[PDB]
Amino acid sequence: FQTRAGCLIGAEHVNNSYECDIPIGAGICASYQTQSIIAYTMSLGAENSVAYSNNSIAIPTNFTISVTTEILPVSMTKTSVDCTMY
Amino acid sequence: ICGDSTECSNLLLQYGSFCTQLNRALTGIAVEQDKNTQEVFAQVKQIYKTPPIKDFGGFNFSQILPDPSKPSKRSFIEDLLFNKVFNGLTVLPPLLTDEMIAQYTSALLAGTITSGWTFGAGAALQIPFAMQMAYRFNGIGVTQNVLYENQKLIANQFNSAIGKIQDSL
Amino acid sequence: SALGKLQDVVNQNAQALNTLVKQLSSNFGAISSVLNDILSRLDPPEAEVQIDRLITGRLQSLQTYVTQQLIRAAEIRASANLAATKMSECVLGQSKRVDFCGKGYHLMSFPQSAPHGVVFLHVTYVPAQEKNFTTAPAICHDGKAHFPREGVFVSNGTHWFVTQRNFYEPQIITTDNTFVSGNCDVVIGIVNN
Amino acid sequence: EAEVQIDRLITGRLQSLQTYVTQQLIRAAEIRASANLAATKMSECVLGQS
Amino acid sequence: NGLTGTGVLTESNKKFLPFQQFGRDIADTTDAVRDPQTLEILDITPCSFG
Ligand SMILES: *[C@@H]1O[C@H](CO)[C@@H](O[C@@H]2O[C@H](CO)[C@@H](O)[C@H](O)[C@H]2NC(C)=O)[C@H](O)[C@H]1NC(C)=O
Ligand SMILES: *[C@@H]1O[C@H](CO)[C@@H](O[C@@H]2O[C@H](CO)[C@@H](O)[C@H](O)[C@H]2NC(C)=O)[C@H](O)[C@H]1NC(C)=O
Ligand SMILES: *[C@@H]1O[C@H](CO)[C@@H](O[C@@H]2O[C@H](CO)[C@@H](O)[C@H](O)[C@H]2NC(C)=O)[C@H](O)[C@H]1NC(C)=O
Ligand SMILES: *[C@@H]1O[C@H](CO)[C@@H](O[C@@H]2O[C@H](CO)[C@@H](O)[C@H](O)[C@H]2NC(C)=O)[C@H](O)[C@H]1NC(C)=O
Ligand SMILES: *[C@@H]1O[C@H](CO)[C@@H](O[C@@H]2O[C@H](CO)[C@@H](O)[C@H](O)[C@H]2NC(C)=O)[C@H](O)[C@H]1NC(C)=O
Ligand SMILES: *[C@@H]1O[C@H](CO)[C@@H](O[C@@H]2O[C@H](CO)[C@@H](O)[C@H](O)[C@H]2NC(C)=O)[C@H](O)[C@H]1NC(C)=O
Ligand SMILES: *[C@@H]1O[C@H](CO)[C@@H](O)[C@H](O)[C@H]1NC(C)=O
Q1: What is the Å distance from ligand 7's center to A13 Cα?
Q2: Which residues 138-157 of C are in CB contact (within 8 Å) with A?
Q3: Residue nearest to atom 24 of ligand 6 (CA)
Q4: Cβ count within 10 A of residue B34
Q5: Who contacts D43 (Cβ-Cβ below 8 Å, separation ≥6)?
Q6: What are the φ and ψ backbone dihedral angles of D43, each rounded to 5 degrees?
Q7: Please, is B144 exposed, middle or buried when counting C-beta atoms within 10 Å of its C-beta (0-12, 13-18, 19+)?
Q8: What's the rounded Cα separation, in Å, for the pair C103 and C124?
Q9: CB contacts < 8 Å between A and B, how many?
Q10: For chain B, give me the number of helices (H) and strands (E)?
């Protein structure tokens, strides 16, 4: 199969679009489905038209409480090398 | 360094692993270039589309909305921007094409024209565009009647000021 | 019972120290990689020429290690400054910056310590189960235009209410939740009620 | 005699390649901060009112 | 004639000047040549790698 990233051997080119799994490049990704290795154009997401008009409004009637995590590196290992003994 | 000659290539082995380090460094900076784009543009879950009949209270977004007869389905102003700007060396392509990034910006732009700031906090909830403009006027400390009584003037000023970006570029 | 952004730092630093250790076994164009085997079977005038190539190679190894540590410490400092700013603005206050403290309307945050980092637990409010309604900018009554004080005018199909904009809680339109400004002939979309 | 002359080229070319790779690390660390600011402006000016 | 290299030679659409014997581009790599018997100029392309 000929991509714009190069020539790809050993993967079948399907026609459906999934989320990206292993990036090949120039818009192509690969994944292990079903049992074989397939290559496809990635999808950006599901489509959605909003019911816009000039006198319509959507107002929520309930809510959820969400808790999510965020991880950040603060520090690293302090190392010294004696330049002469090295 | 050697250019396919076994004499130079054997002498090079005496230098250890300098050339595995250099490749590791360049690979580490070529992966983060795609990470850079993913975090600016993939800020939506859905790809939102704008309605076919576009009446936004007098505001006119036609020079920044996608144009089907154009290359890569870009907006009119995204085109002016794309027109203004061997031996062991290769260039790798980016993971997202330019078509994909123009798709991402048109989904952001249709989300904001149509739902205000609600789609960045949850599900998109539609609201008429002038009522959204009135909420934004409230957010800077002006009352809403000042928008509703000056709607046509505010819309004309906005249209005429979007028309000047296009000239200056 | 995830942490790859912390394991990446550990792995990159171990991978650099391993390369520095392993470059101690290259000749760099000398006869031996071990200095004692040049010293034992050579005399000073010719030991010196072989020792100088080892010195040259090992100095360059060490300099590459130190430059790449300096570039990586500057990336760790930006991360720690961002984590300090999140600790001040997300744990010691409530933020209005969108997406700064999680997805949704920030309510609060809790810190937790990690091996070389920090984990923030962000509590946010996410609205749910939206319904459709008809809206109007203003109400017209007695030849006057009425605007909501804080909310929106909504119709369930037959009746008009005021509600707050994030939670549906309909109330009667009175002179206590509205204010007046002008006639009902200038604003585009007034309804009569 | 060609070993001594090939090593002089090897040393120079290695130096030049490694200078190229250092200056790219320093330039990428600057592009990274610009993209981090662009990601914050997309959140705070496009999906909100600042 | 002494111009030594390796690659794949194709026929070209350049036009030298009668005294010019080979061409080179920016970065000064040889990308064309004249052969000394046909008096025809040939494009030089590096042999695929990756
Ligand atoms: C929004 O503004 C654009 C101007 O950029 C209007 O489109 C052009 O209008 C002129 C004047 O009639 C025409 O000559 C062009 O053919 C129009 N199309 C272009 C330039 O692509 C557009 O009509 C405006 N929208 C509304 C609803 O008025
Ligand atoms: C508000 O009303 C609109 C328009 O009536 C609804 O939009 C529908 O969206 C679906 C998408 O699955 C379309 O197939 C329908 O044609 C649309 N119109 C309908 C059902 O009349 C929208 O779903 C409504 N919103 C809510 C929250 O109920
Ligand atoms: C819109 O809401 C109004 C008021 O909530 C509804 O009118 C009331 O409906 C109840 C139904 O049991 C009656 O008992 C009341 O007498 C009605 N009038 C009042 C309270 O003043 C109306 O039915 C709703 N309309 C729709 C289409 O749902
Ligand atoms: C909002 O849009 C609706 C429909 O696009 C407008 O209703 C039209 O109003 C004009 C004049 O008021 C009529 O000539 C059309 O026949 C109406 N359309 C339909 C389908 O009935 C409405 O005027 C717009 N403005 C608002 C509600 O303020
Ligand atoms: C809302 O009610 C007002 C009256 O309170 C209506 O105003 C009348 O409009 C007609 C037609 O435009 C005029 O001929 C009358 O002179 C108006 N009377 C007054 C007292 O202003 C208005 O038309 C109504 N509008 C709707 C949409 O119901
Ligand atoms: C080099 O010599 C050969 C002959 O030894 C020439 O080849 C002739 O070229 C002409 C074109 O001008 C042809 O019409 C003849 O058929 C060729 N003959 C043979 C035997 O090959 C060639 O032209 C000479 N070139 C130079 C530059 O001297
Ligand atoms: C993919 O879809 C295109 C539709 O244009 C079709 O021509 C092509 O044969 C399809 N390929 C496969 C493997 O189904």
Answers
A1: 9
A2: 152, 154
A3: E37
A4: 15
A5: B43, B120, C97, C98, C99, C100
A6: -75, -40
A7: buried
A8: 7
A9: 79
A10: 7, 1
